[model samples]
Target chain A: RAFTVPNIPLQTLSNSRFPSLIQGMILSPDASQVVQFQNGRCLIDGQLLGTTPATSGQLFRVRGKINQGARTLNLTEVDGKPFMAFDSPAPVGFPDFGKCDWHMRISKTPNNTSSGDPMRSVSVQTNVQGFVPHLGSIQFDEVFNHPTGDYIGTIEWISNPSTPPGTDINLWEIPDYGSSLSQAANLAPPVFPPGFGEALVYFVSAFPGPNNRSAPNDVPCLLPQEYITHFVSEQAPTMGDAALLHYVDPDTNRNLGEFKLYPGGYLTCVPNGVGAGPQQLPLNGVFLFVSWVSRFYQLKPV
Target chain B: TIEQKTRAFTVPNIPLQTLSNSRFPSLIQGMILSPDASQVVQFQNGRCLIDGQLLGTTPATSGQLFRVRGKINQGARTLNLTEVDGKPFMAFDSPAPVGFPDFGKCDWHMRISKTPNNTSSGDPMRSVSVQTNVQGFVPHLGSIQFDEVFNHPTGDYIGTIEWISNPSTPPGTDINLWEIPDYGSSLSQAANLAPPVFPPGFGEALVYFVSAFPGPNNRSAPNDVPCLLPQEYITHFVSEQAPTMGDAALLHYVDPDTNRNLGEFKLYPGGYLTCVPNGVGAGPQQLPLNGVFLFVSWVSRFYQLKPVGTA
Candidate 1:
């Protein structure tokens, strides 16, 4: 059994017994629900925010240990996908809340594109060079160990003005892993790919390092609660939706369209800054925080 | 001094006037009897003698003789005549006059008085007698039987008096008066004084007796009959000293042959025999040799006699 979804590319789905599909991103989100830090300012539902922003760039963040009812959202992306997302005020065209009709396109042709246009966006970009409009997801036994497994969920994204600030943000998982919302990606000849249900991507930098002023690339930028999935890519609208699919550091031209996506604050078991990593703000240079995303599903006993 | 004055003239005649002017001249002045009856009497210059006749040195005229014939009158300041031969027979003057009457209630009689101033009284009241026998004829043997019969008197008279070999009777002499009334004679009167036989050659004697007499006063009373001296004759007499000729004789006199011991009879051996006159006989000669001849020691043999101044 195999299923994949989240920042889609090289899709696959095959199932017989025990399929393997685990993908989580969203470092912390669920539309800004409870995740905090104080004085040094890291807040969410109370909003002082340093990170944790998601508008559906496919959220991604999954701490672990929330294996049961009432805490679910896997929806990951970063080139490996996993899916499922919900926050339940239940209203954006509700039928399980929008998007995913094969990545939702209605025109722009050659293969029926429109992943909101990444120069003819087919989807699958992020190896660190651009416009990660948004990618947040979560799944994999609803965070980690079993029902109620010490919950940690994060999914983030919030970059738009033609995306360009130190790019590279992509997190995807679709092909029905944790049951779809949207995903698709294929770069001709990039077709021997099949294991899809786990994803991750992170990178963003707008240009604020030389004497730091907290503004060069700052419009509420955030993505590094722990980089579960992060992004940046903008300005190549060869044909609209602002030319997506990114990753381009030709030598630090420094305009990798700002982006973000994260969930589950990082301390994924310690080790990126010696433990529970991520704290370099210095007037705001590190970015990412997609608070709260926990997703897991597997049913068989009907 | 002549053997202590011859032991004070052979003294042993305490009858200290027979003791009793209520007797306590310091109670016979500490009387001690038997050293064969006391002696020690001596008065020289002022002169003294009772049986020897010279006198007058009066400390009550000490003529002492206290036991054998019991004499010692010390004149008359009390204990008067405790006589045996010079008899006022048994008189303790006052000590014995308390309650008297015994001696078979007195029918008593005794006499032997021949010293009529024999030599004009030198001291010659010898062998005298003036008794009618009262004071119960001798019964106060008290002081523990007068200390056991006049100082130990029991039996002592073994006799053998002989001498009938005569040429006009020049060898006869017999005298025996064995122990008769000894328990200190409260008067068994020497069993009647019948042991006389002095016929050898008479020296001196004058005696008389007839008491409860039916005869036999002196011939030594036996069946030859006639002998009578009985009335308490000096209670008991004893005199023995046959000085030789086989000395067991009571008395065997025969001295006129001249031993000049002068028929010297002062023999107061056991009871009484008094004769004392010094220039050769003046007063006392008690029962020397009187009449009859046979008195074979009181009824042991012969009889028929009369003396004691004759019947």
Candidate 2:
């Protein structure tokens, strides 16, 4: 089906508080809530979210580029922990303060809780019950699967920035890729990692499409697609929240392929091919391989 | 065991739900500010002015951040601010009031500390001077830490008072604002942030923080558009009868140069603060710490910039 399109100019865009498009997609803080996919069912506070095979929490995160094989939401265990819910009661203000089993502050992150190392952990409650809740009040904290490497990584998706009067930037829009792949490629494309689905489900709703009225052609997508470069085993393994296409992929992770996104808004991924071309391989989302995530964004970038 | 002198992170929200229960917690837990420091509550000889009336007062010289902790004496309604951040909060030998501008011209002080940059000598230590330019405004004392970059993987966006560089003021490259201080410190510690006094290219700078990132998780965030917060009771005008219940601080903030009412600052949970074009000056107390996350959506959905007279 064609993506569920919204009215023109994207009501949320004009309403942005940042002087420019936020570096990443930030869902309206008012529009969304957190949920999880633990024990095989989608839940927020242990309550079910949508009838969808995946996320629709009824909270439109990203309208898929055409339903890419039902948001690859499996792979429940990550780094030895349940992808999300602690199966532990939320601490002192669970849903609000969101603590892991050990009473330090852990919450559904834009999720930035790091009071200290042993005290903080984050989860991605990407689905919700009404944006729903369980026991009528979202109780569980450690649900969902993807524990983001970066703090804002999980949050910028669900939280919109404060929209004060400021100049607008084009790159802040969700990086909408103009794909050459037909509807078939859009369908049974490929079985990708959970991170790919994680980013899409969080960002697709903001894609400027159904014919680019909401996201204009003039605006360039400055949003970065960060990946876990090297997951070292904490005595065994998990995270350091490292590497970006600095072209800096943290921990010296080599570029296996080239993700070349053009300035005019088109993207291509070539297999182990030389990343040589006029096509822009923006260090953030595209491949340039960097260790640091760039906070800066520009329009019509070369 | 090496004793970690851990600073307390969050003061659990007090029993602010009601003042009727005298047995409940006695400390005031929200933020307080006047519309104009002078007109709302000015400090004269350490006395406070409420619209130029010397009723409520605080010390003429005090820390920039005032959590406004007070002991609500049952029955009599007499208020007393006893401590701040655990230290005795001394008021003037008399009484006082505070609105933001109240600290206007509080005067200057300087803090010299070791810098990361080194001297030409073998020592890695370098002493740099920070202008604690307090004129009614007091410069913060600890680290105006410029080391942690925003959104960095190894960055310190958590629990640390990371410094946010002043984006507009390139002239005073050294001037920056302490961005974080125990989550709500933006407003919880409002009095601590002093304006940077620059001489050229940028002179007498007005510090402002801009966030391109989403606010952290808050369960109290409203679930509605033009969000409605019917239970907010965080404001306190020490001298007003029924202090927090019926009375609210009616703050009106204006553009300094243009003399236009830009908007008044409103408070939110964690003492988050923001300005509303048509904000009703009454209600429980709040701050801009979470900016629009706490109030912008509330005003956007409920108030939507209605005529000022709508209040």
Candidate 3:
């Protein structure tokens, strides 16, 4: 019996902000061939092409599919056949600060199915420009070992020195399904060493509008009273708001503070008074991980 | 009537043994000028002359030699002599007086004659040699003088020479001699003595100091006179007092290139006198010599011409 895999339509996962059709080209690592992807089809040196179908002599098959939750395309050379994929996520709406040019390329080696366990390798390279204040170009490279699920990467940011100071770029990550802020108090929290003083936790609401602050609807109340008072006063001026702000020591499972988000869609919580103030974020921006073992969401400040 | 002035000067080639505590032999080196205030006879190669005429010639080895005669114009100066080979000859120019044109700074060079004379003997007491190069009126009193106080083994203090230009003198026939007291006496005590009259030929003189104590040792008492003898009367004074004494003596000169003040040229016991250059800020250079000769010239102030822009 032949095994059947689900076939999904490409347009349903396409980023609506971009043109309906996505096109890209790639050169083989050895420079021996040229391959291009248009819509959901493959082309070689501008000639129409088709997928390599599985056969008895082939140890495996090549395929492509969109991972809607991860917002990434998985192009696999399963066993011995070749496949191609394209990332199909909603395009981020960047503020009209300026225009920029960006490029990315991802490549993977065919899985090794001749041995006990199938193994594959992936490499990705990306370069971005003008996405943040003073940012001239940022280049990122990542590699993944598929069987062991290990990854390593490097990121480099280049900036123009003449830009005005205090301009900031912020990044946010959200999980698809996890315990809400109220249940976060039950999770084992981290501890702080003596004299580690205090820290601030900034919470930003996921709501899209400029004025509507809602959606994070639960706050963890198992925290110190002083921390609760300060977080409420500093982070959420709208006391009865729908958004929730929670803070805990991520290292030792200790609750620090909980409050509602301000109408402005952001909150700053300083759980301890040893040092009091909003903490400075990275000047350019960084990835926000929801958890060490959970799925991630990417956010960009408009 | 224009006064026709002329002065005859004698320069002795004193042997190193005569001035040395070790009785080191001396050889005749070359000569140097003080201020070059006037043009008379230039000394070279054992031949002395005034207007190219034969003045006198002694062997390149002996003292009590070399003389010249010339017309002394309005400004008359003196000479200081030395006896080594060409290895240790020094030259200098005089500082101009106030109201006079500035003659640029002085330059000096020295060369010692023979082998051992070129090398220091490492004796405890050493001799220093100094000469003046001046342009204006000769100061009637001792214009430059210094005191040498001995320290034990390493080095000693040679006081800075105090100088005065064209200073007034008390009306008398005595030539004012400035005395440098012994090592222990207060330097204030080293002052101009009550004017003392000397014989006619020795009246106007240049003083060279001599001490009669033990060698390689400091002057133990404050009473012994470090006698000052006139260079012109040296032949006469040898009969009166023996020359053996302490070996080192401090020499004085007008350093026109530097501060243009009276400066001490100290020759340490090891036959080293440091001639520091002007404006270079480098350490002094060690020059080797036996004794010194003083050279003087008298030129008419009428010929002291200022250059175009200076006046």
Candidate 4:
């Protein structure tokens, strides 16, 4: 099923009560209900709830997903207990709270040697539950209304930090803007300061498909909603030999094989596969990952 | 026992019947019939006599010359008889000449010497005997007694009368007086005849009692006679004479409050006592013992809020 972005703007996000997508999932009081990624386990007050057949009077499953690996782990009912099965095994104790990481790849074009090889990667991190629209500083050497420019966006972890920590992080594209050195003073609304940086790389075509959309085309897809990532970026300088590199943090990587993102908007991933890739286009002719990084820091109450 | 000399007369009334058993001597020799009535006036010691004369005890002796007194009634008039020596004696104003049906009844009162046959010491004689034909024309001679009549079951003379003097006197030579003493029968009859009808309040005043310790074979209850209250004759007299309201008025007043000392109290209007007649009173009239008294008051220590017109 398609997941819609929350309608309320991010200001009241701390006070708002969010609902879980999985049916029969209840958030525990005192917020101790946890999802341990090492073994894909769920516990409340240290008592394990394992998958079993849903029977009369049984404590049913509480389903949730952690974005540490951009993976969905479903704990289904088996014999009246929760049975945890994941599409991917999570890195143990990864994505510690409040930490940030970024990665890049170099993709060499077949006929040429010099344009900065664009790259594609995904980064996953814990975040607060809503969009935090804020201004940041950005700078690039190229000055033009050209299609290519510096881009910055974020994969925000959204949760009621006033409540529990193990809450869901909703991933957003967080639209990026092109910049020019001349009249950079008159940049569009949420003004940016100078001296911010952008880095890019390219990779060998491990998998490729027909180029259909315009150059520097980027599609962004909400994973598990539609596993294929929709890309968005600046325009290309040339045609025919398209060599675009999408810069995504390695932690938010979305190109894992079983991660299916279809046009009808659903996302699932392979049970086990490497995520760093110039991955094959989906059958519908769309690259499976996007570009940009924007992270919003959330301040919790004392 | 000292022998005392005395002279006495006995009379017997002979019945016109014959002797059946010729071997046994007849004990009718001392029977006495009175001169005026020709009835067996007295009987004693198995002898039969008539009008103070000794009748022949032999079988061939003529029963005439035994003058039998008859009673004749001159057609319905009150007959007052002459007294003998300033005392009243029995007299038949109505006499019959021929037989039993013709004989009218006699009422007699007897005076016996207080000290057996000593009549002159002026120790006034008491009424020792009463002779009369009680109802049913059954002539009876009764004498009063003053002694106990039994040994194991002891009882004294509450008074008595016996049916001793039979109409047919046995054959006798002198006096024959059939004597019955302390029978308690005549007094019981007299009591039944002229029973005391209680005045109206007598029963109300009467306190009931039963035996406290009823002996064996005694149906008497444990509640005995002495524990009963006496008849309230004075109360009856007051109830008859005064303008009695039957009973005293019930005392009603306010009970004093906790902190208030009892003072003058107010009674409901028209607070006069009532005087009820017989059987009317505040019953079970329990009273406090000595040094205790009923103190009723409505003191002025506290204020009360009551509805208007209810002070």
Candidate 5:
């Protein structure tokens, strides 16, 4: 596990087996999502965000909802590299489910070393650009399916003067590629030296869009209303989430049926029409939001 | 129109009359079906009324007058009924509150005893009764059972045959010209009858049910539908060629307040929302409040009809 589970007193949790760090490669539990971090954190299931005083950690936005309200969860420096830890509240729910952590990062070198003044400060950059300053980090997650479950968190960074206007923000998740992610460049979205497409790009926030209230390019600025995304329309034009599962027929001891997983919805018999590559046959589990980076829980029903 | 325009309001204080009144007219004003969908009682031009809850598998009450315009020729041997206002009953069967096809497969049959009016002074009081031919009535065959209208105990007189517009017979047409007792009408009676004295704001409008059948089927949540209550629903969503399943009319929903064009609404067979703007479309939306008479679709959406301004 790249992450660890918290002690939630006498209760059965739904996403207890969510995968975390396997062979040092951070995965979104799916092994489907592999991340190579230069420095960052992924928090799920039970989460809360607060600023650690370069000093001691403080749990201010306790998500007892467990609700996590802090918009910016600051990253501290560990061994001269950007880092962070979980000091938030436990996501509330019995038999809770769905969570994962897939963290990654890299050293921030000057954009142009030759043109730089000895100690001039960072320029406006983004995770998409690979030079996101370490000042503060932004977290994102796919809700809908886990609205009533624990907080699911994933973090990425932006340089000072976050989200410049008209900048089309992209949401990308790295592909496991079946091999060779050993190189840091092939580790995450948009490998440096400029390429045709970064990781498997999923969304490009719409400009003049409904979100972006605080600033343009601030894209989908979500409130910590647990799972209620008030700004975006119910059906976002670009993406939808689905969990694919293989059914295990207990009596025959065989994985008999294939079913579509409607995250917050119910299990269905039809294959959901999503554009992403399919996960390996027969397995899909729920995410359990805890600390460290991320964790998951596998479900077995009668 | 969505919920707003479909939102209805009460036109209180309508009268409810019993059978003892001296004057009479024709035309059963309206009816209410229980939330359960089993019974449908009518109000004759707004007098005899009854509460939907109090209306059981028996006649109900209200005070209202009625007069029919369908003139029957006793010598012709046929009685066919049409629409409420050119919108034919033929377009569909009688609505749910009244069973599908009022009094089923009925044909005018007269074996004498039916004499023409020879009264010298005034019109005579007459009545009609229908019964089963009795093969001892088989349930396997799915039979039709009705009251002789006179056989029930006097206490069972939940409604009264107010007046036949033309004072016709069994061989004549069975016009919906009767009165309900008390319980259901408190709301409908107040709305249907034009009170003798009214401030001009209390106007009348002709609202038609969107039925297109030989096809189909309301009164509410469990399948019942009360029409035109100040705020209740007009359970006529999906006026299909048929709910037993088929092609249906859809009610598009939009937030009356936000003016957000929400999406389409269908009730069962898993009627969840479609085309949400940004993300997941899962839950039910609040009924819109803009249209005058709101109509509910099969998938749980509210539609509206405005009272068109008149000349």
Candidate 6:
């Protein structure tokens, strides 16, 4: 007797070690069914087949076409239901889950620089995934994810270098690409210099117009223009004292935020919460200009 | 002694009723001997009718009298009648008493009750008496002071009169009488007298005289005589005015041997000098003679004259 095999559709596997575990027992051959393999038991269309000890020994012969790609695989069912589908490991040149000790070289192209200045470089490196480096005397930390080998979103700089070290600086994720001029310039670098440190640029949300962080699409991101470029001393700046940065709405010329660079090397975006600082940046549609003197600095992450 | 010889002459025995009766309308014709015999006092119509022709419209009444007790001279006819009680019925032979060191033209400090002291007729004398030391010329020579005790009919002293001499000048010689208006009476009553008779001379004298006169008895014709006399005397002797007939008198006499007298004697009624009798003799009078001639009459009638010899 010839027992027909059911053509069951195979679910796409997620990133898990136990990807092929079927949810339920198989049913009739024409209706579609699930087949599962557990321990050494096998089920075909709700019927117990047999037991096997090897992973390949559990396979049953069916009349279908098998298609194979460089990084994927597919099997056609004899009666028209999907039989099986799978993705395979692709060729990789770099390690995907380990630290890549690369120096980050940040340079401005002559076209993008004022007065067409020649390209200058500031490189940073480390042995660890989240390790940071310093350029000149200033130090900063750029954090990353070891699993995806991508930046985790925060860049920390030294707030105070004296003694055991103090407030660690943290920069959030860069705004979505193409969101603003600053966002585009930061998310998409014109030319990546040869280096080991992660060269990350930030962009602020549009401000003084709408699109503030409170807007519908506004997301918390790195504010490129909001930065402390000077060598801060140990003394903390008070409100109403000399501010390190003054952020304004270019459209209305209204002040959006006032930042203070502490002597401890900590940069406070704005002393006022919620209604000011990066929170006041536009949520979408407009490009933000970040006016700043390029200064090379670095810090180590603890 | 010349005294006995000079006294050998006699004055006629005049009727006493003629001098004392103040109610009758009689006149007495008589003569009187001077102690010095230098003059003779001829009484006619109750006045010294000889010399300058003494006269009277009414007889003398029993009030008081003053006689000339000293010798007569050209410039002065001295009188020994220093003081007397009763309506004076005598006259002077001169305009003023001169050559007499002590006496002026007359000797009586006479006062008449224009309003009688009798309270029976509702008219009452204020128990107020005014006395002035000034003599001769009238027009207020010296201060005139008053002492008054405001009395009801029962002679109850209710209040007093206060004399404010020259009230225009401050710190005046103010004399407060025994009392002011009755203790129960309001101060306004005391201050509201017609002439402020209590403050005498503060108002018109006539009003004050009429309001303050003692009332209720014998306020007849002679009543006004006393009131008018003193009121006029106050107006002249104290308030500054020349003597008038109703307020003064001049007694003319003759020596009988020479049949002569001094300057013409004059009299006044209201304030003007007039020879006609005012029917009221309300001024000082004296005789330039030695004895006191007591005139008895009733209300302007001279019934008799009693000769009382000098001491």
lDDT of 5 by residue, B240-293 (tens): 102223122233444445645444332222111111122122222122223221
For every model shown, what is its TM-score relative to the native structure? 0.12, 0.21, 0.14, 0.12, 0.18, 0.13
In candidate 5, residue B153 scores what lDDT? 16
Task: Report the CAPRI category for model 1.
Answer: incorrect
Ignoring the other chain, what TM-score does chain B have in each prediction?
0.18, 0.20, 0.20, 0.16, 0.21, 0.19
TM-score of chain B of 4: 0.16
Model 3 DockQ (Cα-based): 0.00
Best model number under TM-score: 2
lDDT at A25, model 5: 9
On the 0 to 100 scale, the lDDT of residue A110 in model 1 is 15
Error of 6 at A246 (Å): 99
Estimate, for each residue in B1-311, the C-alpha lDDT of model 2 and write its tens digit.
12212211111111222111110111112322222222211122122221112222222111211212223222322223333222344333222223111212111111111121122222111111112231211212112222112221121111111111222223333321121112112433434221222211111111122211112212322111010111112111111112121112222333334545434433322122233322345322333221111112222212222122223
* Model 4 lDDT, residue B261, Cα: 20
List ranges where model 6 is wrong by over 4 Å.
A1-302, B1-32, B39-45, B48-311
Candidate 1 at residue B277, lDDT?
27
Q: Model 6, residue B3: displacement in angstroms? A: 48
Q: Cα miss at A51, model 5 (Å)?
A: 54
Cα lDDT, model 6, residue A38: 17
User: What is the TM-score of candidate 2?
Assistant: 0.21
Report chain A TM-scores, every model: 0.16, 0.18, 0.21, 0.15, 0.21, 0.19
* Interface C-alpha RMSD after superposing true interface residues, each candidate, one decimal: 99.9, 22.6, 55.5, 79.0, 41.6, 77.1
Work out how many backbone clashes candidate 5 has: 95
Alpha-carbon shift of residue B154 in model 6 (angstroms): 19
lDDT tens readout by residue for model 1, A121-193? 0111121222111233322212222233232222111111122444322111111212133222210111111
